[PDB]
């Protein structure tokens, strides 16, 4: 089941038992890393980095080829964002919903969804302050939302 929603879907990805890099892939670990670096220079979060690398460059799992995952590769190079991508997406969604609320006041559906999104923001922020990815003085506030995008 979902964390707030009552649904229970099964749609996900099934990784294979072969952790081995396939024979047909001619890219080396380094070339994967410069592809990662240039896509990070284009302004892409690790999700679209992995999606483009899987879709066009033929690397199924970066962790299988380079031996390390994408966020650690960007963290060693230092091209790693100050917020994790999911929290950033949640905050962007909260800004968009709040802008719609300012345009449209009676849309109480968006008010309930806004409360839901901020609840997800607060739980994820508690997690990130737990493992020191965020500084312990971090706080989410309504008017301090458009500055983080």
């Amino acid at each position: 089941g979902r964390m707030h929603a009552p649904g229970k879907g099964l749609s996900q990805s099934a990784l294979p038992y072969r952790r081995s890099v396939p024979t047909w892939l001619k890219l080396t670990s380094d070339d994967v890393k410069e592809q990662i670096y240039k896509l990070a220079k284009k302004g892409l979060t690790p999700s679209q980095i992995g999606v483009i690398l899987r879709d066009s460059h033929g690397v199924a799992q970066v962790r299988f080829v380079t031996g390390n995952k994408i966020l650690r590769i960007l963290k060693s190079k230092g091209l790693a964002p100050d917020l994790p991508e999911d929290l950033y997406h949640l905050i962007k969604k909260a800004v968009a919903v709040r802008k719609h609320l300012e345009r449209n006041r009676k849309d109480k559906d968006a008010k309930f969804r806004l409360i839901l999104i901020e609840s997800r923001i607060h739980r994820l922020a508690r997690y990130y302050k737990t493992k020191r990815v965020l500084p312990p003085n971090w706080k989410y506030e309504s008017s301090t939302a458009s500055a983080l995008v």
């Binding site: 099964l10 099934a14 990784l15 038992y17 396939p22 047909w24 999606v51 879709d55 066009s56 199924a60």
Partner: protein
Amino acid sequence: PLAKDLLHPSPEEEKRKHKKKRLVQSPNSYFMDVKCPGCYKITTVFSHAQTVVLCVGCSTVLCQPTGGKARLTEGCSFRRKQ
């Protein structure tokens, strides 16, 4: 009824089952080589690609993303790998 070996399922039964619900899970997707009719270069594309894939030199559209597998352009050729 009440008696079938779970360790050795028949391959059509394993193919029919959901990818997570198999004995050991395995994906339904694959990587394939695509050749544009306007050139000779081969490109590796994921079957369920979500991004539109362009040719390196021709810059033609190779696949369009859809709900499931990607729609390859009429004219391109492809071959499944491994």
